[PDB]
Each structure stands twice: as structure tokens, then as C-alpha cells.
């Protein structure tokens, strides 16, 4: 059949993979295998992805989920391509939309959400640290007041991680950040933080979240947030990657018909895996226990 460039809207639960792009397999391994098996691309294009002009918008890290990843590639446009690809994927990865595009077609503005147990906001001394903890309206206000401080453009140099010495200037722009009202599943309360920004740096969102957890739990005074903008280095706690979900990438390309499917997949596949892992493996709880190591 005809060779065309297409773009895919893809979603996946990230647990059990080492990221989108190449030691667990990666999401692209599952996608490349489905493409090969479905007959969309020849074996040598699976062996060397550069040969099908494969590109991904976001190089999601180990364990990170996505409701709205986008990739582009050249394929033979076989009949029922979407169903055929999906038939070779496990249930926790799905192609949600697929469009043919020009060949003039080739990412930095994104929305993420971060799903976490609400005891991440329980005060170390005044609240219980167990899962019976319930977020007060007052604590959620404090959380949202602190997260709103991130909006605008600031020097986020303390919110990344360098191999070598820290780069003293790392200005970045944040359009919005807030925490939604909590919800409960089998006695476990969670909430979703959403952030929209541009050109997120390695570990930036995880440390943005980690600092507000540290403040709200009582390890650091609120002053530390404005202070962290300054030239001095600050050791900002880095919350785990488990809860992080790529929700939307912004570049024309209109994924509006697919929003119902995006929501359904987040609800049925992405969030239950995060919840179940927090319940069974206590990732957040264990991470919070490390907060005393930070010198504030």
C-alpha cells in the first residue's frame, strides 16, 4: 500500500518500562514490535527506526506515564491501521488517534499531571502520617497558594539536576499550576496536581512538587520557595516519577475528537496503576521518609 507520513496520539502506563525512547524495554519497543507485526513498516525500519523517520515529542523518563504522547513516522498505510497496531499492544499502551500529515511535518509546551497520595501534604507533627489522613480545605489552600508562586518566569536553576556543577541561570516559564480537590479509592485519598509550562528541564516538575511537599509537611519554611530563585544553591527534594503523567503536548494538529478516549484511558489504565502501586508498594510513603536528609 501507499507510503505516507502519519502522526499518532499514544497513551501508556509507564510502570515496567525504562522510558519512551531507548534495563527494561521501552514504550517504543512495544510500538516498533506492533508496527513490524502489523505490517506497517518493514523489519529493517524496526531495526533502525531512523529509516522510517521516527520522531517522538517527549522523551518520557523511566516509570513516567502519558495520556497524550505524540509520535510521527512513515508507514505503509494499511487498511484498519489503527486497530491492527493496537491488536499487537498490551492493554496498557494504546494508540488513541492517528492522522496522515504532509511530510513537512515534524513539542516544548506541555501539560503534565502528577497523581499523589494526599498524606504527602500531612504536617509531620500536627496530622497523622497514615492513609486515614484527609486533606483539609485549609491545607489544599496552602498547597495551591505555594504552587501558584511557580507561575510566571523564574530562575529554576535549583529545580534541575546536573552531572557536573549547577548552571546558575535556568529561566523557565510556567503558565499554570494547581492541585485538584482530592478523591478516595478504598480508603486511600489522592489528588491530582496539574502544571502547564514550556521547556521543562530534567527533574524540574518532580522537584517543583517535592519542594511544596517539603514546605507543606513542615520540613522547610515557605520562604524557601522565593529563596530557591536566588543564586545560592538549594537542595530541592525530588518527588518520585511514578505519579507523573504527560497529558498534552502543544505545537497545526487538533486532537479534539479523541478527548473522550484520552480521559477514559487515563481513568481506566493510567491512574489505577499508580494507585495500585502506591497501595501495594508504598512508593510515596517511602520517599517521604527521606525528607529529613535535606538541609533547609
CA distance 215 to 52: 48
DSSP bridge pairs for 4? 75
Per-residue cell: 77: 498505510
- How does 229-250 read in b/e, with b if 16+ C-beta sit within 10 Å? eeeeebebbbbbbbbbbbbbbe
Active-site pick, 29, 30, 48, 61: 61
CA distance 252 to 10: 18
8 Å CB contact between 131 and 102: no
Give me Rg for the CA atoms of the chain: 20
Q: CB-based contacts of 143: which residues, under 8 Å, 6+ apart?
A: 121, 179, 212, 216
Known catalytic residue at 235: no
Residue 58 half-sphere exposure toward CB, CA atoms < 13 A: 32
Q: Which residues are identified as catalytic? A: 61
Amino acid at each position: 500500500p501507499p507510503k505516507r507520513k502519519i502522526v499518532l496520539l499514544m497513551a501508556y502506563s509507564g510502570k515496567g518500562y525504562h522510558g519512551m525512547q531507548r534495563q527494561f524495554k521501552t514504550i517504543e519497543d512495544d510500538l516498533v514490535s506492533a508496527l513490524v507485526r502489523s505490517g506497517c513498516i518493514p523489519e529493517n525500519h524496526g531495526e533502525d527506526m531512523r529509516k522510517m523517520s521516527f520522531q517522538r515529542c517527549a522523551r518520557t523518563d523511566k516509570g513516567v506515564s502519558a495520556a497524550g504522547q505524540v509520535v510521527s513516522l512513515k508507514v505503509w498505510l494499511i487498511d484498519d491501521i489503527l486497530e491492527k497496531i493496537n491488536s499487537h499492544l498490551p492493554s496498557h499502551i494504546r494508540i488513541l488517534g492517528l492522522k496522515r500529515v504532509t511530510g513537512g511535518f515534524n513539542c516544548d509546551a506541555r501539560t503534565y499531571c502528577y497523581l499523589l497520595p494526599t498524606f504527602a501534604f500531612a504536617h509531620k507533627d500536627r496530622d497523622v502520617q497514615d492513609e486515614t489522613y484527609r486533606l483539609s480545605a485549609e491545607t489544599l489552600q496552602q498547597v495551591n497558594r505555594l504552587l501558584a508562586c511557580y507561575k510566571g518566569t523564574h530562575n529554576f536553576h535549583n529545580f534541575t539536576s546536573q552531572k557536573g556543577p549547577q548552571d546558575p541561570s535556568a529561566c523557565r516559564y510556567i503558565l499554570e499550576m494547581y492541585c485538584e480537590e482530592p478523591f478516595v479509592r478504598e480508603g486511600l485519598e489522592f489528588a491530582v496536581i496539574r502544571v502547564k509550562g514550556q521547556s521543562f528541564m530534567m527533574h524540574q516538575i518532580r522537584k517543583m512538587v517535592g519542594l511544596v511537599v517539603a514546605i507543606v509537611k513542615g520540613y522547610a519554611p515557605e520562604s524557601v520557595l522565593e529563596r530557591s530563585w536566588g543564586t545560592e544553591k538549594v537542595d530541592v527534594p525530588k518527588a518520585p516519577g511514578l505519579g507523573l503523567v504527560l497529558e498534552r503536548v502543544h505545537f497545526p494538529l487538533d486532537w479534539a475528537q479523541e478527548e473522550g478516549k484520552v480521559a477514559a484511558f487515563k481513568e481506566e489504565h493510567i491512574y489505577p496503576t499508580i494507585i495500585g502501586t502506591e497501595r501495594d508498594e508504598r512508593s510515596m510513603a517511602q520517599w517521604l521518609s527521606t525528607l529529613p536528609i535535606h538541609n533547609f
